[PDB]
RNA sequence: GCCUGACAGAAAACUUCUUAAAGGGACACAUUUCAAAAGAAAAAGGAAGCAUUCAGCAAUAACAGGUCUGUGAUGCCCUUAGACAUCUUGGGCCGCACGCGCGCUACAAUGGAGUUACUAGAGAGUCCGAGAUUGAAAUAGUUAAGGAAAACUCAAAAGAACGUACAUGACAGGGAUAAAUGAUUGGAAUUAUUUGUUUUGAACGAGGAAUUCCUUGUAAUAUCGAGUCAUUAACUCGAGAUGAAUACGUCC
């Protein structure tokens, strides 16, 4: 039909499955600690999250 | 000074050599290397009896031990390509054969947490 | 009396008590150390002040870190420190003072730990100071 | 020894490596089966048959050069000067069917599909 | 678009009953509550904003209507 | 040095007597060439290192042997027994006189002939006799222990067959024209 | 009674280390800001 | 391995017992609906008839005796390369007989 | 003199 | 009929019954950012000026489940509200 | 309870080592010399004396430096139902006549190969990290407590010790290239994802002009964890293991 074939390809493994929580960028996802926040975005909200630049 | 209370008062290598007919020879004593990293089979034909004594000693010092805790103990480095060397588990069938054979001899046992020595097994090596 | 010897990471926790001049490290005699090239090194305190001081002393030293040489340098520390502490808690301080003077005269590290420790790798290089090669052209 | 000449200075397990079908691990096995001391120097009829007839001489099928042979037969039969001829008929077989792996062999390129843009710099 | 005949009333009821309906921007999955792909939910009611029925606030790859 | 050799040795020339730690204090007679001190934090702290300790650490070069003290000392410990066999004298004494004889006395700077500081005399002496043993034990049947042993005994008295002596008179002869 | 917070048996702290490239693209020198935040655990028993 | 006359009539389930490790593992998994929709057409065209040329993108198919003599077109990147299946080009993958690029010039 | 596993010097 | 079987949950990771201590603070920290940017585009004319997510043991107390609003006395000292005023002007 | 002080199974207290809170602890003060002074240098003590060491933040002003291929941040232009929107099948960014950069591995006897005891630090775990049992030659296939973790898992190799072995030999250093066959992950492995066994056994004999990094647990040497991840590190981010030399100087 019109949408019967739409999005028929199964995407379960994940490079185009997992997306950033806010940015939606498909590269550089920080899946550590389950953030699912890709870079260039976690840096903005790391202070809000609780992460601070220490040594 | 020097006093004897257990087998920790002698060197490990000489005791193993001094500890080397129940251990019947299997069919793969010649066509088998002691692991997967290695590229050559053991040289001495008595290599099992050196390995058999060593595996007994590992059970002696480490009470709760398993087969996979012996595969990592008798491991080596993978230096077969241009990649940097990384650790790799040793062969399993050669290692677990001695333990099963030691089970019939009455030296080792099968506890709920792996393998452990027996009454006669501890006594036999001390003498 | 319990003392300790320190190194990079290796720690040699001892237990000084009266005995028969017997020294065991993790259950094995000190004569049966794994790196035999360092057999003499760990025994240096024994010949520095003589074995009569250690004749009636027992030592039970446990090592729980470092490497083969870091532990060996901690063993010599806990041995020398144990004699100092035993001569302090029970024997008079005058006798300990002459013993410490000979120890500190030979090797200061025998009685105090090395403050040096590993540094931290930084971005843009393989080590603490070294950096990656630069390709101008 | 198997239509080949070997150096008589090295040990027997390490002198049989000159055979094009016998290498390092294979050589050590045939020295154990034949009952010849490994530490003895190379400097005989019992060896030239175990190399060519190893199935009945206590050998495993996974210790064989030619496993699952075509044109009937299941033995290796490669520990000889047969190494080159057996290899050739495999290469020409792929070209006959014009298979892709054969096509690259015809052009002398990298058969196993590697990055040939930078490495493999034999100027021609 | 050509959304299920009965579901148009069903999707409208949740907005009327609660005042807030939340849909994701991921158009390949299905709405966890409605059992229908997220494409239809946003497709039908993006014309509601033209009729000033709801607002069109979007946040963190989610679409909001009120 | 290993409960085998004594430290009743002297130094021929006084130019290195105050700069070589042999038996001056009680901290230099050490049971092993393995001391983990900080000899490179202040200028002229390396003089407090034992002479054999400094010699041992110079056998730890060329990349693949970096940071291997145990492997290096074994070469030295089994070499001072060879030096005693070939000289029937103190191996420590043989090393001490070898340093003096192989030490350069005049180099050149970019050329102008200039003398060498007593510490640099010691530093260059060690750098010379180890290089000859390192190169002559490369792709050779002979072991490094004898290779190090023969160089020291050769460079000890006057022999010009040693690498150290050739280089010591190579710079002086070049500086002999650079006056 | 056990308490954990981002700011008694004192369980060792488990620092949460995350490192990212400062730039939003590939241009510029390689500089990494080492982000971290510890977790402190205390145990009360009676 | 064995003779063609003794290999084309015996069922292909036992044929893959001696095939390649990849070929005897892909067969173990459930048949693809796209692979099964091919063999229906391959035998259908053979009975009607030089067999007619069929076109498919299923370059993943393992060569099996059920297409022992068909004519198969395979999509490389832009067109269907006609190949006539022969016994000598068996369970090697069906895509290996169609280049996807100009080799070198 | 000494005979270890690395050298045989006599 | 749509050939779509994947389903993305409309849930929050703080609600998990059992979760690692490392993940708990991170998942809660991420929820702080999402909620704070939720009312960002909602309370623009109001100047939310901050959110607090204190918990009373069983119920989540949201301060600008239920909602609480506290009017900040120091309106000038808040940069979030001030930046809105500059944007408005 | 077992054995010639060791080991195994339940217990009762202590905090030096372990963990982590608070405070204490060095300020170059104390001496000597040099500079009315800011200050400089040696030695002793001290756990720690170059700002004690390494790090994060880091001003005024600027580039017409990179990203609108990160975004529901956006201006302007352009395409807008036969589309540059969206989706499906296949191919590619992996293609080689060559040149350049970052790196890995070797050119060995301070070594390779064979056996043994070893010694860490720092990470990560919800169907996820996976103990234990077995069949096996290994990759791996069947059954599986514990763990939302100082609890269970998660474990060292460089090096050493053991032999009448290897002995200057492109050799047993080197492991590219391929020929066979066996599985793992995946809807799918062909242009080999990865990988096991046997065979094939190449350049490389310490590298020309140039050029990079480095002053103390530093360089260097070998390894481990994590990022990426259905499967794949020779990359990056970190950690410990052993521990060189040369300087305490000048603008060439």
Automatic annotation (TrEMBL), chain A:
**Which cofactors are named for this entry?**
Zn(2+)
Return the GO cellular component terms, semicolon-separated: cytosolic small ribosomal subunit
PROSITE patterns the record matches: RIBOSOMAL_S14
A Gene Ontology annotation in the biological process aspect, one of them, is: cytoplasmic translation
InterPro entries attached here? Answer: Ribosomal_uS14 (IPR001209), Ribosomal_uS14_CS (IPR018271), RIbosomal_uS14_euk_arc (IPR039744), Ribosomal_uS14_sf (IPR043140)
Q: Which controlled-vocabulary keywords does the entry list?
A: Ribonucleoprotein, Ribosomal protein, Zinc
An MF annotation (GO) of this entry: structural constituent of ribosome
* Family affiliation: Belongs to the universal ribosomal protein uS14 family.
Among PANTHER family, the record links this protein to: 40S RIBOSOMAL PROTEIN S29 (PTHR12010)
This one is known as Ribosomal protein S29, putative
Source organism (scientific name) = Entamoeba histolytica (strain ATCC 30459 / HM-1:IMSS / ABRM)
Automatic annotation (TrEMBL), chain G:
What name goes with this protein? Answer: Small ribosomal subunit protein uS10
Q: Which residues cross the membrane?
A: none
Which family is this sequence assigned to?
Belongs to the universal ribosomal protein uS10 family.
Q: Which residues of the full protein are shown?
A: 22 to 91 of 118
Record the organism: Entamoeba histolytica (strain ATCC 30459 / HM-1:IMSS / ABRM)
Automatic annotation (TrEMBL), chain H:
Q: Which GO terms describe its biological process?
A: translation
Which GO CC annotations does the UniProt entry carry?
cytosolic small ribosomal subunit
UniProtKB keywords: Ribonucleoprotein, Ribosomal protein
The GO terms describing molecular function are: RNA binding; structural constituent of ribosome
Per the record, the domain of life is Eukaryota
| Family, as annotated | Belongs to the universal ribosomal protein uS19 family.
What this protein is called in its record is 40S ribosomal protein S15, putative
TrEMBL record, chain J:
For whether the record's keyword set contains Ribosomal protein, the answer is: yes
Top-level taxon:
Eukaryota
Gene Ontology CC, one term: nucleus
Could you provide one GO biological process annotation from this protein's UniProt record?
translation
Q: Name one GO molecular function term.
A: RNA binding
Task: Tell me the keywords, alphabetical order.
Answer: Ribonucleoprotein, Ribosomal protein, RNA-binding
Q: What is the similarity comment for this entry?
A: Belongs to the universal ribosomal protein uS3 family.
What is the name listed in the Swiss-Prot or TrEMBL entry for this protein?
A: 40S ribosomal protein S3
What is the scientific name of the source organism?
A: Entamoeba histolytica (strain ATCC 30459 / HM-1:IMSS / ABRM)
The portion of the full protein included here is 1 to 122 of 244
């Amino acid at each position: 039909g019109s949408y019967s074939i739409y999005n028929a390809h199964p995407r379960n493994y994940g490079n185009g499955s997992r997306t950033c929580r806010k940015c939606g960028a498909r590269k550089g996802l920080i899946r550590k600690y389950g953030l699912d926040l890709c870079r260039r975005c976690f840096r903005e909200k790391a202070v809000e999250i609780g992460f601070q630049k220490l040594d | 000074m020097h006093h004897f209370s257990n087998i920790k008062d002698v060197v490990a290598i000489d005791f193993i050599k001094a500890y080397a007919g129940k251990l019947e020879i299997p069919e793969w004593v010649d066509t088998v290397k002691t692991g997967m990293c290695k590229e050559l089979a053991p040289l001495n034909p008595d290599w099992i009896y050196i390995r058999a004594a060593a595996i007994a000693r590992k059970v002696y010092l480490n009470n709760g031990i398993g087969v996979m805790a012996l595969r990592r103990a008798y491991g080596d480095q993978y230096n077969k390509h241009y990649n940097p060397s990384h650790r790799t588990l040793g062969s399993g069938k050669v290692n677990r054969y001695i333990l099963q054979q030691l089970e019939k001899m009455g030296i080792v046992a099968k506890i709920q947490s792996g393998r452990s020595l027996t009454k006669e097994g501890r006594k036999d090596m001390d003498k | 009396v319990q003392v300790f010897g320190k190194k990079k990471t290796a720690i040699a926790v001892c237990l000084c008590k009266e005995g028969k001049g017997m020294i065991r490290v993790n259950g094995v005699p000190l004569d049966l150390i794994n790196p035999p090239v360092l057999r003499i090194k760990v025994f240096e305190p024994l010949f520095i002040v003589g074995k009569e001081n250690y004749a009636k002393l027992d030592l039970k030293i446990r090592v729980t870190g470092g490497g083969q040489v870091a532990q060996a340098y901690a063993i010599r520390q806990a041995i020398a420190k144990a004699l100092i502490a035993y001569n302090q808690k029970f024997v008079d301080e005058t006798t300990k003072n002459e013993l410490k003077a000979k120890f500190l005269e030979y090797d200061r590290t025998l009685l105090v730990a090395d403050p040096r420790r590993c540094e931290a790798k930084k971005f843009g290089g393989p080590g603490a100071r070294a950096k990656y090669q630069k390709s101008y052209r | 020894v198997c239509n080949t000449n070997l150096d008589g200075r090295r040990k027997v397990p390490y002198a049989l490596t000159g055979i094009k079908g016998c290498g390092r691990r294979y050589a050590y096995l045939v020295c154990k089966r034949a009952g010849i001391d490994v530490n003895k120097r190379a400097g005989i009829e019992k060896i030239v048959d175990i190399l060519n007839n190893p199935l009945n001489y206590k050998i495993p099928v996974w210790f064989l050069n030619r496993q699952k042979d075509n044109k009937d037969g299941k033995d290796s039969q490669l520990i000889a000067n047969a190494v080159e001829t057996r290899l050739r008929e495999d290469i020409e077989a792929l070209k006959k069917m014009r298979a892709h792996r054969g096509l690259r062999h015809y052009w002398g390129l990298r058969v196993r599909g590697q990055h040939t843009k930078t490495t493999g710099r034999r100027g021609r | 678009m050509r959304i299920a005949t009965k579901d148009i009333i069903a999707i409208y009821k949740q907005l009327f009953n609660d005042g807030c309906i939340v849909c994701h921007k991921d158009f390949v999955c299905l709405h966890p509550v409605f059992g229908i792909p997220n494409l239809q939910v946003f497709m039908l009611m993006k014309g509601l904003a033209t009729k000033k029925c709801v607002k069109e606030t979007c946040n963190w790859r989610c679409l909001y209507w009120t | 040095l290993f409960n085998k050799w004594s430290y009743d040795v002297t130094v021929s020339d006084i130019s290195l007597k105050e700069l070589l730690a042999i038996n001056s204090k009680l901290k230099y007679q050490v049971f092993l060439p393995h001391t983990a001190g900080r000899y490179q934090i202040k200028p002229f702290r390396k003089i407090q290192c034992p002479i054999v300790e400094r010699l041992v650490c110079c056998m730890m070069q060329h990349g693949k042997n970096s940071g291997k003290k145990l492997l290096a000392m074994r070469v030295v410990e089994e070499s001072f027994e060879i030096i005693h066999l070939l000289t029937e004298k103190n191996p420590i004494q043989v090393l001490v006189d070898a340093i003096i004889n192989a030490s350069p006395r005049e180099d050149s700077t970019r050329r102008q002939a200039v003398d060498v500081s007593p510490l640099r005399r010691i530093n260059q002496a060690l750098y010379l006799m180890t290089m000859g043993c390192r190169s002559a034990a490369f792709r050779n049947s002979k072991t490094l222990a004898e290779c190090l042993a023969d160089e020291i005994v050769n460079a000890s008295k006057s022999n010009t067959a040693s690498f150290a002596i050739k280089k010591k008179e190579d710079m002086e002869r070049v500086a002999k024209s650079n006056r | 009674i056990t308490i954990t917070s981002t700011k008694p048996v004192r369980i060792p702290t488990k620092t949460l280390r995350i490192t990212t490239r400062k730039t939003p693209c590939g241009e510029g020198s390689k500089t990494w800001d080492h982000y971290q935040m510890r977790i402190y655990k205390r145990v009360l028993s009676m | 391995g064995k003779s063609l006359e003794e290999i084309t009539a015996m069922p292909e389930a036992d044929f893959v017992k001696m095939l390649d490790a990849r070929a005897r593992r892909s067969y173990r998994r459930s048949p693809k609906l796209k692979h099964e929709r091919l063999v229906k057409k391959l035998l259908k065209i053979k009975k009607a008839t030089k067999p007619k040329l069929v076109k498919t993108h299923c370059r993943d198919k393992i060569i099996l005796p059920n297409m022992i003599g068909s004519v198969i077109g395979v999509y490389n990147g832009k067109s269907f390369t006609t190949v006539e299946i022969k016994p000598e080009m068996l369970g090697h993958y069906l895509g290996e007989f169609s280049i996807t690029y100009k080799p070198v010039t | 003199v000494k005979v270890d596993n690395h050298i045989w010097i006599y | 009929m749509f050939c779509l079987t994947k389903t993305k949950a409309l849930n929050v990771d703080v609600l998990k019954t059992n979760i690692s201590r490392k993940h708990k603070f991170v998942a809660d920290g991420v929820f702080y950012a999402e909620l704070n940017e939720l009312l960002q585009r909602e309370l623009s004319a109001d100047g939310y000026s901050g959110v607090e997510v204190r918990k009373n043991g069983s119920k989540f107390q949201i301060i600008i489940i239920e909602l609480y609003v506290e009017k900040v006395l120091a309106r000038g000292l808040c940069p979030v509200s001030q930046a809105e005023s500059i944007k408005y002007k």
